[PDB]
Design a protein around this ligand. Structure first.
Ligand SMILES: Cc1cc2nc3c(=O)[nH]c(=O)nc-3n(C[C@H](O)[C@H](O)[C@H](O)COP(=O)(O)OP(=O)(O)OC[C@H]3O[C@@H](n4cnc5c(N)ncnc54)[C@H](O)[C@@H]3O)c2cc1C
Length: 407
Protein backbone atom coordinates (compact mmCIF):
# COMPACT_ATOMS: atom_id res chain seq x y z
CA UNK A 1 0.00 0.00 0.00
CA UNK A 2 2.98 2.38 0.29
CA UNK A 3 5.99 2.31 -2.10
CA UNK A 4 8.55 4.59 -3.75
CA UNK A 5 7.98 3.42 -7.33
CA UNK A 6 4.97 1.52 -8.60
CA UNK A 7 5.79 -0.46 -11.78
CA UNK A 8 2.76 -1.46 -13.80
CA UNK A 9 3.49 -4.53 -15.91
CA UNK A 10 5.91 -7.42 -15.50
CA UNK A 11 7.20 -7.37 -19.06
CA UNK A 12 10.78 -6.69 -20.07
CA UNK A 13 10.09 -2.99 -19.66
CA UNK A 14 8.91 -3.17 -16.07
CA UNK A 15 11.21 -5.98 -15.04
CA UNK A 16 14.27 -4.09 -16.23
CA UNK A 17 12.90 -0.78 -14.83
CA UNK A 18 12.07 -2.48 -11.54
CA UNK A 19 15.51 -4.14 -11.06
CA UNK A 20 17.38 -0.83 -11.52
CA UNK A 21 15.15 0.95 -9.04
CA UNK A 22 15.51 -1.84 -6.49
CA UNK A 23 19.25 -1.84 -7.18
CA UNK A 24 19.42 1.65 -5.64
CA UNK A 25 17.82 0.69 -2.31
CA UNK A 26 14.38 2.06 -3.01
CA UNK A 27 11.12 0.22 -2.51
CA UNK A 28 9.59 -0.78 -5.81
CA UNK A 29 6.61 -2.89 -6.71
CA UNK A 30 5.38 -4.44 -9.94
CA UNK A 31 1.66 -5.18 -10.32
CA UNK A 32 1.09 -7.60 -13.15
CA UNK A 33 -2.46 -8.14 -14.41
CA UNK A 34 -1.83 -11.57 -15.87
CA UNK A 35 -0.79 -14.92 -14.48
CA UNK A 36 2.75 -15.91 -15.61
CA UNK A 37 3.81 -17.57 -17.77
CA UNK A 38 1.70 -15.52 -20.18
CA UNK A 39 1.87 -15.28 -23.95
CA UNK A 40 2.91 -12.16 -25.72
CA UNK A 41 4.28 -11.57 -29.16
CA UNK A 42 7.72 -10.12 -29.87
CA UNK A 43 10.18 -12.96 -29.80
CA UNK A 44 13.37 -11.94 -31.65
CA UNK A 45 15.66 -9.76 -29.52
CA UNK A 46 18.52 -7.51 -30.48
CA UNK A 47 22.12 -7.51 -29.23
CA UNK A 48 21.54 -4.00 -27.87
CA UNK A 49 19.20 -5.36 -25.14
CA UNK A 50 21.99 -7.46 -23.79
CA UNK A 51 23.19 -4.18 -22.28
CA UNK A 52 20.12 -3.82 -20.11
CA UNK A 53 19.86 -7.50 -19.31
CA UNK A 54 23.44 -7.16 -18.08
CA UNK A 55 22.86 -4.07 -16.00
CA UNK A 56 19.68 -5.41 -14.37
CA UNK A 57 21.49 -8.64 -13.45
CA UNK A 58 19.26 -10.81 -15.64
CA UNK A 59 22.01 -12.33 -17.82
CA UNK A 60 22.65 -15.47 -15.76
CA UNK A 61 18.94 -16.32 -15.34
CA UNK A 62 18.34 -15.89 -19.07
CA UNK A 63 21.42 -17.97 -20.05
CA UNK A 64 20.23 -20.78 -17.77
CA UNK A 65 17.08 -21.03 -19.88
CA UNK A 66 18.93 -22.26 -22.96
CA UNK A 67 17.07 -20.07 -25.47
CA UNK A 68 18.03 -20.18 -29.12
CA UNK A 69 21.06 -17.95 -29.75
CA UNK A 70 20.80 -15.31 -32.46
CA UNK A 71 23.84 -14.14 -34.49
CA UNK A 72 22.14 -12.06 -37.18
CA UNK A 73 19.27 -11.24 -39.50
CA UNK A 74 18.75 -12.79 -42.95
CA UNK A 75 16.62 -11.29 -45.69
CA UNK A 76 15.13 -13.34 -48.48
CA UNK A 77 13.56 -12.20 -51.73
CA UNK A 78 12.96 -15.18 -54.00
CA UNK A 79 16.45 -16.67 -54.14
CA UNK A 80 18.22 -13.41 -53.37
CA UNK A 81 19.81 -13.41 -49.95
CA UNK A 82 21.17 -10.66 -47.75
CA UNK A 83 22.70 -12.08 -44.57
CA UNK A 84 23.68 -9.62 -41.82
CA UNK A 85 26.18 -11.00 -39.30
CA UNK A 86 26.18 -9.22 -35.93
CA UNK A 87 29.83 -10.25 -35.61
CA UNK A 88 30.69 -7.82 -38.41
CA UNK A 89 29.38 -4.35 -37.66
CA UNK A 90 30.45 -0.75 -37.50
CA UNK A 91 29.71 -0.29 -33.76
CA UNK A 92 31.34 -1.77 -30.66
CA UNK A 93 28.96 -3.69 -28.47
CA UNK A 94 27.09 -6.94 -28.33
CA UNK A 95 27.16 -9.29 -31.25
CA UNK A 96 24.67 -11.92 -30.17
CA UNK A 97 21.40 -12.55 -28.36
CA UNK A 98 18.34 -14.74 -28.20
CA UNK A 99 15.14 -15.85 -29.84
CA UNK A 100 12.71 -16.37 -26.99
CA UNK A 101 9.17 -17.46 -26.31
CA UNK A 102 8.06 -14.43 -24.30
CA UNK A 103 6.02 -16.39 -21.73
CA UNK A 104 9.13 -18.15 -20.47
CA UNK A 105 11.41 -15.15 -21.15
CA UNK A 106 9.28 -12.65 -19.25
CA UNK A 107 8.89 -15.03 -16.32
CA UNK A 108 12.64 -15.63 -16.20
CA UNK A 109 13.07 -11.85 -15.83
CA UNK A 110 10.27 -11.23 -13.39
CA UNK A 111 11.37 -14.16 -11.27
CA UNK A 112 14.93 -12.83 -11.21
CA UNK A 113 13.64 -9.36 -10.25
CA UNK A 114 11.63 -10.80 -7.30
CA UNK A 115 14.70 -12.73 -6.20
CA UNK A 116 16.69 -9.48 -6.43
CA UNK A 117 14.25 -7.99 -3.95
CA UNK A 118 11.58 -6.58 -6.21
CA UNK A 119 8.15 -7.56 -5.01
CA UNK A 120 6.12 -8.85 -7.90
CA UNK A 121 2.41 -9.40 -7.58
CA UNK A 122 0.52 -11.24 -10.32
CA UNK A 123 -3.16 -11.43 -11.27
CA UNK A 124 -3.73 -7.87 -10.16
CA UNK A 125 -4.69 -5.44 -12.93
CA UNK A 126 -4.47 -1.67 -12.56
CA UNK A 127 -7.87 0.02 -12.83
CA UNK A 128 -7.44 3.68 -11.96
CA UNK A 129 -4.70 6.15 -11.17
CA UNK A 130 -5.17 9.46 -9.36
CA UNK A 131 -2.38 12.03 -9.19
CA UNK A 132 -1.64 14.62 -6.54
CA UNK A 133 1.38 16.53 -7.74
CA UNK A 134 3.92 13.75 -8.30
CA UNK A 135 2.50 11.36 -5.71
CA UNK A 136 -0.14 8.85 -6.82
CA UNK A 137 -2.86 6.51 -5.56
CA UNK A 138 -3.39 3.46 -7.79
CA UNK A 139 -6.26 1.01 -7.56
CA UNK A 140 -5.76 -2.65 -8.48
CA UNK A 141 -8.26 -5.45 -8.90
CA UNK A 142 -7.41 -9.03 -7.97
CA UNK A 143 -8.88 -12.11 -9.64
CA UNK A 144 -11.80 -12.01 -7.23
CA UNK A 145 -12.86 -8.48 -8.11
CA UNK A 146 -11.70 -6.94 -4.85
CA UNK A 147 -9.95 -3.57 -5.00
CA UNK A 148 -7.04 -2.05 -3.09
CA UNK A 149 -4.96 1.12 -3.44
CA UNK A 150 -1.21 1.71 -3.70
CA UNK A 151 0.54 4.89 -2.77
CA UNK A 152 3.64 5.93 -4.66
CA UNK A 153 6.20 8.69 -5.21
CA UNK A 154 6.35 7.61 -8.86
CA UNK A 155 4.68 5.38 -11.42
CA UNK A 156 6.59 3.72 -14.26
CA UNK A 157 3.88 2.62 -16.65
CA UNK A 158 5.38 -0.46 -18.27
CA UNK A 159 1.91 -1.79 -19.20
CA UNK A 160 2.90 -2.38 -22.82
CA UNK A 161 -0.07 -3.12 -25.04
CA UNK A 162 -2.38 -2.18 -22.15
CA UNK A 163 -1.27 1.40 -22.54
CA UNK A 164 -2.53 1.93 -19.06
CA UNK A 165 -1.69 5.57 -18.58
CA UNK A 166 -1.97 6.70 -22.19
CA UNK A 167 -5.60 5.44 -22.22
CA UNK A 168 -6.65 6.70 -18.81
CA UNK A 169 -5.67 10.28 -19.60
CA UNK A 170 -6.11 10.11 -23.36
CA UNK A 171 -2.46 10.16 -24.40
CA UNK A 172 -2.84 8.10 -27.60
CA UNK A 173 -1.60 9.71 -30.85
CA UNK A 174 -2.02 8.01 -34.21
CA UNK A 175 1.25 6.61 -35.49
CA UNK A 176 1.63 7.86 -39.04
CA UNK A 177 2.33 4.38 -40.34
CA UNK A 178 -0.66 3.00 -42.22
CA UNK A 179 -2.58 0.02 -40.83
CA UNK A 180 -1.13 -3.47 -41.33
CA UNK A 181 -2.35 -6.96 -40.42
CA UNK A 182 -0.52 -9.96 -39.06
CA UNK A 183 -1.13 -13.70 -38.82
CA UNK A 184 1.24 -15.99 -36.95
CA UNK A 185 1.71 -19.10 -34.85
CA UNK A 186 4.39 -21.45 -33.63
CA UNK A 187 5.19 -24.45 -35.80
CA UNK A 188 6.82 -27.71 -34.71
CA UNK A 189 9.83 -27.30 -36.96
CA UNK A 190 10.41 -30.96 -37.83
CA UNK A 191 12.02 -30.02 -41.14
CA UNK A 192 14.32 -27.32 -39.80
CA UNK A 193 17.65 -27.02 -41.70
CA UNK A 194 20.71 -28.54 -40.00
CA UNK A 195 21.47 -21.02 -40.44
CA UNK A 196 19.44 -21.43 -37.23
CA UNK A 197 21.36 -18.58 -35.66
CA UNK A 198 19.29 -16.09 -37.68
CA UNK A 199 15.92 -14.47 -37.70
CA UNK A 200 14.79 -14.64 -41.32
CA UNK A 201 12.57 -12.04 -42.94
CA UNK A 202 10.99 -13.06 -46.25
CA UNK A 203 9.93 -10.64 -48.95
CA UNK A 204 6.68 -12.32 -49.88
CA UNK A 205 4.88 -9.68 -51.96
CA UNK A 206 5.49 -5.98 -52.58
CA UNK A 207 3.87 -4.99 -49.28
CA UNK A 208 3.78 -8.30 -47.41
CA UNK A 209 6.63 -9.98 -45.54
CA UNK A 210 7.19 -12.92 -43.26
CA UNK A 211 9.21 -13.71 -40.14
CA UNK A 212 10.74 -17.13 -39.30
CA UNK A 213 12.16 -17.24 -35.74
CA UNK A 214 13.76 -20.48 -34.55
CA UNK A 215 13.49 -21.48 -30.89
CA UNK A 216 15.47 -24.12 -28.95
CA UNK A 217 12.28 -25.99 -28.02
CA UNK A 218 11.80 -27.46 -31.48
CA UNK A 219 9.32 -24.81 -32.51
CA UNK A 220 9.55 -21.87 -34.84
CA UNK A 221 7.50 -18.69 -34.71
CA UNK A 222 6.27 -17.80 -38.18
CA UNK A 223 4.30 -14.67 -39.01
CA UNK A 224 2.89 -13.05 -42.11
CA UNK A 225 2.91 -9.25 -41.89
CA UNK A 226 1.54 -6.79 -44.38
CA UNK A 227 -1.16 -5.14 -46.41
CA UNK A 228 -4.53 -6.23 -44.96
CA UNK A 229 -6.14 -6.60 -48.40
CA UNK A 230 -3.70 -9.46 -48.93
CA UNK A 231 -5.09 -11.50 -45.96
CA UNK A 232 -8.61 -11.02 -47.24
CA UNK A 233 -7.60 -12.99 -50.32
CA UNK A 234 -7.63 -16.12 -48.20
CA UNK A 235 -10.88 -17.60 -46.93
CA UNK A 236 -11.37 -20.03 -44.07
CA UNK A 237 -10.24 -20.73 -40.53
CA UNK A 238 -7.15 -19.00 -39.06
CA UNK A 239 -5.32 -22.29 -39.40
CA UNK A 240 -6.51 -22.89 -42.96
CA UNK A 241 -5.64 -19.42 -43.97
CA UNK A 242 -2.30 -19.61 -42.23
CA UNK A 243 -1.45 -22.93 -43.90
CA UNK A 244 -2.58 -21.37 -47.20
CA UNK A 245 -0.29 -18.36 -46.86
CA UNK A 246 2.74 -20.55 -46.04
CA UNK A 247 1.94 -22.73 -49.10
CA UNK A 248 2.17 -19.62 -51.25
CA UNK A 249 5.79 -18.89 -50.29
CA UNK A 250 8.52 -20.88 -51.98
CA UNK A 251 11.07 -20.24 -49.27
CA UNK A 252 9.02 -21.98 -46.53
CA UNK A 253 6.18 -23.85 -48.24
CA UNK A 254 7.75 -27.27 -48.23
CA UNK A 255 9.41 -26.73 -44.84
CA UNK A 256 6.14 -26.13 -42.95
CA UNK A 257 3.71 -28.10 -45.11
CA UNK A 258 1.87 -30.52 -42.83
CA UNK A 259 3.80 -29.62 -39.62
CA UNK A 260 1.88 -29.19 -36.38
CA UNK A 261 0.84 -25.78 -35.02
CA UNK A 262 1.20 -25.32 -31.26
CA UNK A 263 -1.84 -23.02 -31.23
CA UNK A 264 -4.51 -21.60 -33.55
CA UNK A 265 -3.02 -18.63 -35.49
CA UNK A 266 -3.66 -15.20 -34.00
CA UNK A 267 -4.27 -11.85 -35.73
CA UNK A 268 -3.01 -8.44 -34.85
CA UNK A 269 -3.95 -5.34 -36.88
CA UNK A 270 -3.38 -1.58 -36.56
CA UNK A 271 -0.57 -2.20 -34.11
CA UNK A 272 1.15 1.13 -34.86
CA UNK A 273 0.47 3.79 -32.23
CA UNK A 274 2.14 6.70 -30.42
CA UNK A 275 1.80 8.85 -27.30
CA UNK A 276 1.25 12.61 -27.12
CA UNK A 277 3.89 12.75 -24.38
CA UNK A 278 6.14 10.10 -22.85
CA UNK A 279 6.02 11.35 -19.23
CA UNK A 280 4.32 13.69 -16.82
CA UNK A 281 4.27 14.65 -13.21
CA UNK A 282 4.51 11.40 -11.30
CA UNK A 283 5.11 9.06 -14.21
CA UNK A 284 7.08 7.91 -17.20
CA UNK A 285 5.84 5.71 -20.05
CA UNK A 286 7.96 2.80 -21.32
CA UNK A 287 8.03 0.28 -24.16
CA UNK A 288 4.73 -0.24 -25.88
CA UNK A 289 3.03 2.19 -23.54
CA UNK A 290 5.08 4.69 -25.54
CA UNK A 291 5.18 4.18 -29.31
CA UNK A 292 5.25 1.02 -31.43
CA UNK A 293 6.59 1.31 -35.02
CA UNK A 294 6.50 -2.07 -36.83
CA UNK A 295 7.78 -5.62 -36.26
CA UNK A 296 10.12 -5.87 -39.29
CA UNK A 297 13.40 -5.29 -37.54
CA UNK A 298 12.40 -6.90 -34.23
CA UNK A 299 13.13 -3.98 -31.95
CA UNK A 300 10.07 -3.71 -29.75
CA UNK A 301 11.38 -5.61 -26.73
CA UNK A 302 14.74 -3.93 -27.01
CA UNK A 303 13.08 -0.51 -26.95
CA UNK A 304 11.01 -1.72 -23.96
CA UNK A 305 14.16 -2.62 -22.02
CA UNK A 306 15.97 0.53 -23.13
CA UNK A 307 13.10 2.73 -22.04
CA UNK A 308 12.57 0.64 -18.90
CA UNK A 309 16.22 1.12 -18.08
CA UNK A 310 16.22 4.87 -18.80
CA UNK A 311 12.97 5.56 -16.99
CA UNK A 312 14.27 3.41 -14.18
CA UNK A 313 17.54 5.25 -13.79
CA UNK A 314 15.74 8.55 -14.15
CA UNK A 315 12.99 7.69 -11.59
CA UNK A 316 15.80 7.01 -9.11
CA UNK A 317 17.24 10.47 -9.74
CA UNK A 318 13.75 11.80 -9.00
CA UNK A 319 13.43 9.89 -5.72
CA UNK A 320 16.83 11.17 -4.57
CA UNK A 321 15.65 14.75 -4.98
CA UNK A 322 17.90 15.37 -7.98
CA UNK A 323 16.83 17.55 -10.92
CA UNK A 324 15.60 15.53 -13.88
CA UNK A 325 15.41 16.72 -17.45
CA UNK A 326 12.85 14.26 -18.79
CA UNK A 327 12.65 16.04 -22.08
CA UNK A 328 16.43 15.50 -22.58
CA UNK A 329 17.48 12.45 -20.51
CA UNK A 330 14.46 10.38 -21.56
CA UNK A 331 12.34 11.62 -24.47
CA UNK A 332 15.09 12.84 -26.79
CA UNK A 333 16.90 9.61 -26.01
CA UNK A 334 14.00 7.28 -26.84
CA UNK A 335 13.11 9.27 -29.97
CA UNK A 336 16.68 9.24 -31.32
CA UNK A 337 16.46 5.48 -31.31
CA UNK A 338 12.79 5.35 -32.31
CA UNK A 339 13.26 7.83 -35.14
CA UNK A 340 16.17 5.82 -36.52
CA UNK A 341 14.16 2.56 -36.76
CA UNK A 342 11.27 4.57 -38.19
CA UNK A 343 13.43 5.60 -41.18
CA UNK A 344 14.45 1.96 -41.69
CA UNK A 345 10.81 0.82 -41.45
CA UNK A 346 9.72 3.34 -44.05
CA UNK A 347 12.60 2.15 -46.22
CA UNK A 348 11.62 -1.44 -45.69
CA UNK A 349 8.23 -0.62 -47.20
CA UNK A 350 9.12 1.98 -49.84
CA UNK A 351 11.63 -0.06 -51.81
CA UNK A 352 14.82 1.88 -50.96
CA UNK A 353 16.16 -0.60 -48.30
CA UNK A 354 15.63 -3.69 -50.48
CA UNK A 355 17.71 -2.10 -53.23
CA UNK A 356 20.52 -1.66 -50.69
CA UNK A 357 20.02 -5.19 -49.27
CA UNK A 358 19.88 -6.96 -52.60
CA UNK A 359 22.45 -4.87 -54.45
CA UNK A 360 24.97 -6.99 -56.33
CA UNK A 361 28.39 -6.59 -54.66
CA UNK A 362 27.03 -4.65 -51.70
CA UNK A 363 29.59 -2.37 -50.08
CA UNK A 364 30.85 -4.22 -47.00
CA UNK A 365 31.19 -0.98 -44.99
CA UNK A 366 27.62 0.05 -45.66
CA UNK A 367 26.65 -3.50 -44.70
CA UNK A 368 28.45 -3.13 -41.37
CA UNK A 369 26.86 0.22 -40.63
CA UNK A 370 23.45 -1.15 -41.54
CA UNK A 371 24.27 -4.18 -39.42
CA UNK A 372 24.73 -2.09 -36.26
CA UNK A 373 21.38 -0.47 -36.88
CA UNK A 374 19.86 -3.98 -36.97
CA UNK A 375 21.70 -4.86 -33.77
CA UNK A 376 20.10 -1.90 -31.95
CA UNK A 377 23.06 0.44 -31.83
CA UNK A 378 20.92 3.29 -33.12
CA UNK A 379 22.44 5.77 -30.65
CA UNK A 380 25.88 5.56 -32.25
CA UNK A 381 25.94 8.98 -33.94
CA UNK A 382 29.27 8.16 -35.64
CA UNK A 383 27.42 5.55 -37.72
CA UNK A 384 26.47 7.41 -40.88
CA UNK A 385 23.32 5.29 -41.22
CA UNK A 386 22.24 6.53 -37.78
CA UNK A 387 23.51 10.06 -38.44
CA UNK A 388 21.68 10.37 -41.78
CA UNK A 389 18.77 7.95 -41.24
CA UNK A 390 15.91 9.95 -42.84
CA UNK A 391 18.03 10.49 -45.94
CA UNK A 392 20.58 7.77 -46.59
CA UNK A 393 18.26 4.97 -47.81
CA UNK A 394 16.52 6.96 -50.48
CA UNK A 395 19.93 8.47 -51.28
CA UNK A 396 21.85 5.18 -51.32
CA UNK A 397 19.20 3.51 -53.52
CA UNK A 398 19.31 6.23 -56.12
CA UNK A 399 23.12 5.89 -56.17
CA UNK A 400 22.71 2.13 -56.71
CA UNK A 401 20.44 2.62 -59.74
CA UNK A 402 22.71 5.33 -61.17
CA UNK A 403 25.31 2.57 -61.01
CA UNK A 404 23.09 0.07 -62.77
CA UNK A 405 22.40 2.31 -65.82
CA UNK A 406 26.09 3.08 -66.31
CA UNK A 407 26.80 -0.59 -67.11
C1 LIG B 1 3.35 -8.86 -35.00
C2 LIG B 1 4.39 -8.33 -34.00
C3 LIG B 1 5.68 -8.86 -33.98
C4 LIG B 1 6.63 -8.35 -33.08
N1 LIG B 1 7.87 -8.87 -33.07
C5 LIG B 1 8.81 -8.42 -32.22
C6 LIG B 1 10.11 -8.93 -32.17
O1 LIG B 1 10.55 -10.04 -32.98
N2 LIG B 1 11.01 -8.45 -31.30
C7 LIG B 1 10.65 -7.47 -30.49
O2 LIG B 1 11.56 -7.04 -29.61
N3 LIG B 1 9.41 -6.94 -30.49
C8 LIG B 1 8.47 -7.39 -31.33
N4 LIG B 1 7.24 -6.85 -31.34
C9 LIG B 1 6.95 -5.82 -30.34
C10 LIG B 1 6.65 -6.32 -28.94
O3 LIG B 1 5.75 -7.25 -28.86
C11 LIG B 1 6.76 -5.37 -27.78
O4 LIG B 1 7.70 -4.45 -28.05
C12 LIG B 1 7.12 -5.95 -26.42
O5 LIG B 1 6.31 -6.93 -25.95
C13 LIG B 1 6.95 -4.83 -25.45
O6 LIG B 1 7.35 -5.01 -24.11
P1 LIG B 1 6.52 -4.22 -22.92
O7 LIG B 1 7.26 -4.53 -21.62
O8 LIG B 1 6.62 -2.81 -23.25
O9 LIG B 1 4.97 -4.59 -22.88
P2 LIG B 1 4.36 -6.01 -22.82
O10 LIG B 1 5.35 -6.96 -23.37
O11 LIG B 1 3.01 -6.10 -23.53
O12 LIG B 1 3.98 -6.28 -21.27
C14 LIG B 1 3.19 -5.34 -20.57
C15 LIG B 1 2.64 -5.98 -19.29
O13 LIG B 1 1.79 -5.13 -18.61
C16 LIG B 1 0.73 -5.96 -18.21
N5 LIG B 1 -0.45 -5.13 -18.06
C17 LIG B 1 -1.18 -4.63 -19.03
N6 LIG B 1 -2.17 -3.92 -18.49
C18 LIG B 1 -2.06 -3.98 -17.16
C19 LIG B 1 -2.81 -3.44 -16.10
N7 LIG B 1 -3.93 -2.66 -16.33
N8 LIG B 1 -2.42 -3.71 -14.85
C20 LIG B 1 -1.35 -4.47 -14.63
N9 LIG B 1 -0.61 -4.99 -15.61
C21 LIG B 1 -0.95 -4.76 -16.88
C22 LIG B 1 0.58 -6.94 -19.28
O14 LIG B 1 -0.10 -8.13 -18.81
C23 LIG B 1 1.91 -7.15 -19.72
O15 LIG B 1 2.55 -8.20 -19.06
C24 LIG B 1 6.29 -7.31 -32.19
C25 LIG B 1 4.98 -6.78 -32.22
C26 LIG B 1 4.05 -7.30 -33.13
C27 LIG B 1 2.60 -6.75 -33.15
Amino acid sequence: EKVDVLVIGAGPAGTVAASLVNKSGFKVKIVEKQKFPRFVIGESLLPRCMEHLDEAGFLDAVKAQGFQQKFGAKFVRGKEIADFNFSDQFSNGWNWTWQVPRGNFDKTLADEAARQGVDVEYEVGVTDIKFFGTDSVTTIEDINGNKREIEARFIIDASGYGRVIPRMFGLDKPSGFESRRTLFTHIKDVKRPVEGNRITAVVHKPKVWIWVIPFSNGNTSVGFVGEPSYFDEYTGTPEERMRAMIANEGHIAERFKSEEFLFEPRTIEGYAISASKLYGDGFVLTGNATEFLDPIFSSGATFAMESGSKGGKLAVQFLKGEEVNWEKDFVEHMMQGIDTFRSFVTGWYDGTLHAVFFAKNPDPDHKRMICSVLAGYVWDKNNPFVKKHNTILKTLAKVIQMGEEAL
